[PDB]
Design an enzyme around this catalytic site. Sequence first.
Site, PDB file in Angstrom:
ATOM      1  CG  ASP A 134      -9.922  12.875   6.867  1.00  0.00           C
ATOM      2  OD1 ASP A 134     -11.129  12.696   6.509  1.00  0.00           O
ATOM      3  OD2 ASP A 134      -9.028  13.042   6.032  1.00  0.00           O
ATOM      4  N   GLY A 175       0.797  -1.216   0.000  1.00  0.00           N
ATOM      5  CA  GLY A 175       0.000   0.000   0.000  1.00  0.00           C
ATOM      6  C   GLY A 175       0.826   1.261   0.000  1.00  0.00           C
ATOM      7  CB  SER A 176       1.742   3.971  -1.305  1.00  0.00           C
ATOM      8  OG  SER A 176       1.085   4.071  -2.534  1.00  0.00           O
ATOM      9  N   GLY A 177       0.079   5.917   0.311  1.00  0.00           N
ATOM     10  CA  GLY A 177      -0.727   7.107   0.189  1.00  0.00           C
ATOM     11  C   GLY A 177       0.194   8.301   0.187  1.00  0.00           C
ATOM     12  CD  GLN A 197       0.094  10.893   6.642  1.00  0.00           C
ATOM     13  OE1 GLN A 197       0.594  11.330   7.680  1.00  0.00           O
ATOM     14  NE2 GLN A 197      -1.022  10.158   6.632  1.00  0.00           N
ATOM     15  N   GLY A 198       3.371   8.104   2.814  1.00  0.00           N
ATOM     16  CA  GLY A 198       4.427   7.088   2.667  1.00  0.00           C
ATOM     17  C   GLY A 198       4.073   5.866   1.846  1.00  0.00           C
ATOM     18  CB  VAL A 202       3.009   0.576   3.538  1.00  0.00           C
ATOM     19  CG1 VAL A 202       3.097  -0.395   4.717  1.00  0.00           C
ATOM     20  CG2 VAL A 202       2.636   1.981   3.992  1.00  0.00           C
TER      21      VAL A 202
HETATM   22  N1  LIG Z   1       0.743  -1.930   9.534  1.00  0.00           N
HETATM   23  C1  LIG Z   1       0.071  -2.189   8.259  1.00  0.00           C
HETATM   24  N2  LIG Z   1      -0.366  -3.407   7.968  1.00  0.00           N
HETATM   25  C2  LIG Z   1      -0.996  -3.647   6.818  1.00  0.00           C
HETATM   26  N3  LIG Z   1      -1.225  -2.703   5.953  1.00  0.00           N
HETATM   27  C3  LIG Z   1      -0.826  -1.460   6.216  1.00  0.00           C
HETATM   28  C4  LIG Z   1      -0.135  -1.167   7.360  1.00  0.00           C
HETATM   29  N4  LIG Z   1       0.138   0.142   7.346  1.00  0.00           N
HETATM   30  C5  LIG Z   1      -0.322   0.631   6.207  1.00  0.00           C
HETATM   31  N5  LIG Z   1      -0.916  -0.352   5.519  1.00  0.00           N
HETATM   32  C6  LIG Z   1      -1.526  -0.311   4.176  1.00  0.00           C
HETATM   33  O1  LIG Z   1      -0.952   0.637   3.487  1.00  0.00           O
HETATM   34  C7  LIG Z   1      -2.100   1.549   3.016  1.00  0.00           C
HETATM   35  C8  LIG Z   1      -1.634   3.057   3.149  1.00  0.00           C
HETATM   36  O2  LIG Z   1      -0.881   3.165   4.350  1.00  0.00           O
HETATM   37  P1  LIG Z   1      -0.956   4.577   5.166  1.00  0.00           P
HETATM   38  O3  LIG Z   1      -2.304   4.636   5.747  1.00  0.00           O
HETATM   39  O4  LIG Z   1       0.066   4.670   6.270  1.00  0.00           O
HETATM   40  O5  LIG Z   1      -0.670   5.775   4.138  1.00  0.00           O
HETATM   41  P2  LIG Z   1      -0.885   7.401   4.337  1.00  0.00           P
HETATM   42  O6  LIG Z   1      -0.738   7.887   5.784  1.00  0.00           O
HETATM   43  O7  LIG Z   1       0.270   7.946   3.505  1.00  0.00           O
HETATM   44  C9  LIG Z   1      -2.565   7.891   3.637  1.00  0.00           C
HETATM   45  P3  LIG Z   1      -4.062   7.050   4.496  1.00  0.00           P
HETATM   46  O8  LIG Z   1      -3.776   6.989   5.943  1.00  0.00           O
HETATM   47  O9  LIG Z   1      -5.282   7.865   4.285  1.00  0.00           O
HETATM   48  O10 LIG Z   1      -4.319   5.648   3.952  1.00  0.00           O
HETATM   49  C10 LIG Z   1      -3.232   1.237   4.014  1.00  0.00           C
HETATM   50  O11 LIG Z   1      -4.446   1.718   3.507  1.00  0.00           O
HETATM   51  C11 LIG Z   1      -3.130  -0.087   4.141  1.00  0.00           C
HETATM   52  O12 LIG Z   1      -3.642  -0.814   3.103  1.00  0.00           O
HETATM   53 MG   LIG Z   2      -2.322   7.864   7.304  1.00  0.00          MG
END
Ligand SMILES: Nc1ncnc2c1ncn2[C@@H]1O[C@H](COP(=O)(O)OP(=O)(O)CP(=O)(O)O)[C@@H](O)[C@H]1O
Ligand SMILES: [Mg+2]
Length: 350
Positions: free
Chosen positions: A144, A26-28, A30-31, A33
């Site tokens: 949010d 995953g990603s968004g 902020q980072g 993953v």
């Molecule tokens: N500890 C974890 N275990 C499994 N999946 C995770 C994870 N942390 C993050 N993810 C996955 O990675 C995706 C994006 O991660 P993250 O939420 O940290 O990004 P982000 O803060 O940049 C934007 P948002 O929070 O809105 O999704 C998640 O929606 C999820 O699918």
């Molecule tokens: Mg987040």
Amino acid sequence: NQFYSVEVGDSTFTVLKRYQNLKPIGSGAQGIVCAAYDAVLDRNVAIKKLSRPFQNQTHAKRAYRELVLMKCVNHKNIISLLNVFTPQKTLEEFQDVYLVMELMDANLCQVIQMELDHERMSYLLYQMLCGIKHLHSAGIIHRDLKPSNIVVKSDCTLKILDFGLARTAGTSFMVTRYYRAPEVILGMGYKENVDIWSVGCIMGEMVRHKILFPGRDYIDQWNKVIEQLGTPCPEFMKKLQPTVRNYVENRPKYAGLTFPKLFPDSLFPADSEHNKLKASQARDLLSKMLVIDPAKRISVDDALQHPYINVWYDPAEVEAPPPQIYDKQLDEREHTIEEWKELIYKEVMN
Ligand SMILES: Nc1ncnc2c1ncn2[C@@H]1O[C@H](COP(=O)(O)OP(=O)(O)CP(=O)(O)O)[C@@H](O)[C@H]1O
Ligand SMILES: [Mg+2]
Ligand SMILES: CCCCCCCCCCCC[N+](C)(C)CCCS(=O)(=O)O
Ligand code: NA
Ligand code: NA
């Protein structure tokens, strides 16, 4: 050397050698993953590389805050930090931050698509409420919450992934806006039960398998709210800002659909008497969360007492001691990028 580099999900991960077989999950904004195998511990983990944490003060503030809070908080329904590291050796060279978390199986967006039975759905809601109660007790009001920042294991254990923004950001978010409360959208301020509206939107989506209040922008989203729930009272439209009040008072008038029409029996399991009981209990909870006026909206504590949720209630999970955060100015103080960088470095180096 203690680090190696691997290209995963179109980005360079330079990580400790203990972390093996990185795969993108995953990603968004902020980072990015990855899942990995930790060889020191003997378990899978999730590694997030922060995206451009020093691009500007918002990025840095949010990174610092997420780091301090994730470390400080210790609750089964909030994601834990197992490790944090940087491959760079000095403050001057410092660029990347890697957060290592427990590895979960899916985000709520995926789980939401399932034909969820009442045991699963009530259990998932119960856990979100526990996590939210815990965050609230420390003065963390998310604002949010959305499916993409909530993760689940295949046993339906649930963790919230982040903390929303600082109090100083108020109701502002300078992609997915569908879960934000009316008081947020319209700029009225907020209290703790602002997060209940988001839980209502997720719950409503678990039932309908459609986003409850979709739309290209807030204007379209507000139309979807009033078309479904009805035009708000005099008790509420009162308080809106000049241009907003006028727009909101001048929209077409809507009675609302009843909760039976918004969430008909047709959306719920129909097998049994247990199922009929649970459809009306689910509906009744939805009718108390999806309430435009926050003064009339159910609280987190009361939602935990609701018959749909309370079956799961265990005071060991619900009533844990609140986080005491050291930095009482955490949400307020502003710093240059350089200054944030040092605060984050110190935090990473422990
Ligand atoms: N500890 C974890 N275990 C499994 N999946 C995770 C994870 N942390 C993050 N993810 C996955 O990675 C995706 C994006 O991660 P993250 O939420 O940290 O990004 P982000 O803060 O940049 C934007 P948002 O929070 O809105 O999704 C998640 O929606 C999820 O699918
Ligand atoms: Mg987040
Ligand atoms: C249909 C979309 C409408 C968008 C309208 C935008 C509303 C304008 C903002 C008003 C700010 C009012 N104060 C009193 C400053 C609010 C407190 C700060 S906060 O609410 O906690 O952010
Ligand atoms: Na935790
Ligand atoms: Na209206």
